[PDB]
Design a protein around this ligand. Structure first.
Ligand SMILES: C=C1C[C@H]2[C@]3(C)CCC(=O)C(C)(C)[C@H]3C(=O)[C@@H](O)[C@]2(C)[C@H]2C(=O)O[C@](C)(C(=O)OC)C(=O)[C@]12C
Ligand SMILES: [Ca+2]
Ligand SMILES: [Ca+2]
Lengths: 140, 140
């Protein structure tokens, strides 16, 4: 797979991700793929089923959620390990208000480069905690 | 610069980084290089001058600092853009006890690949807030 092949699979992952359904967030992933969170305070590993359940839970809070690659100049491609690094803006609307953040996504593509075989996501964990505090504060 | 050229210059950056003096932390950098700290809650851009001053200040709290590549097999190298990505365990000895965390470092090498021309660092920002909380507790 070419450099352009690896990015294109990664862009496709993003496009389907932004549909924000359990179906779409798995449709560019190999069924054995895992999704790792970076940084000890938030480390977690999700197989496909756990990702679908995470997405469904997230839709109970987020009314919209879109990510986008801020700048293709910053994108990192390792043709030998079939890895792509994106730095993304995430924007969303939630029952506890606005979500606005940035994160770094790392993809390892399958041997044919057509699917995502592994994901590493690094979030602004302090922002995550703060968002979770808004959630913890629900009252009626 | 070969894939191995790029990695060696980044390993040397790491080595001088662990020496942790205002001089060592710039010895592997170009004179115009900038360091960016990722994520909105800790965004920052530092030229060589500000980096030395930040390191000197940080030496008032960190007595010793070791960043280590967790796994050479996870390293990402982009020969076309001259970028190396490390996922690193960080281990500090500080005036309020141990620092234990993880970070991702992105180096962009100079054209000849002997120096570091640009740096992005992604830290566990919730842990930074918790460490700064530990400092707020120094009490005598
Ligand atoms: C060596 C450091 C210290 C570094 C540090 C204080 C090290 C301990 C940490 O893990 C935390 C996350 C607290 C670090 C930062 O806050 C970094 O932000 C800091 C201050 C480094 C920095 O920002 O700039 C240097 C030059 C760097 O490594 O950028 C390449 C850089 O050299 C800095 C100044
Ligand atoms: Ca909670
Ligand atoms: Ca404080």
């Amino acid at each position: 797979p070419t450099r352009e092949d690896l990015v294109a699979t990664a862009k496709l992952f993003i496009a389907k991700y932004n549909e924000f359904t359990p179906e779409s967030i798995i449709s560019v992933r190999t069924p054995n793929s895992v999704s790792h969170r970076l940084f000890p305070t938030r480390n977690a590993t999700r197989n496909i089923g756990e990702s679908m359940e995470a997405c469904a839970n997230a839709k109970e809070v987020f009314k919209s959620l879109t990510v986008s690659v801020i700048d293709d100049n910053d994108t990192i491609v390792d043709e030998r390990t079939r890895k792509v690094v994106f730095y993304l803006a995430s924007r969303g609307d939630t029952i506890v208000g606005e979500w606005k953040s940035e994160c770094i996504f790392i993809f390892q593509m399958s041997e044919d480069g057509k699917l995502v075989d592994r994901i590493w996501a690094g979030f602004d964990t302090a922002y995550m905690d703060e968002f979770e505090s808004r959630l913890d504060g629900i009252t009626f």
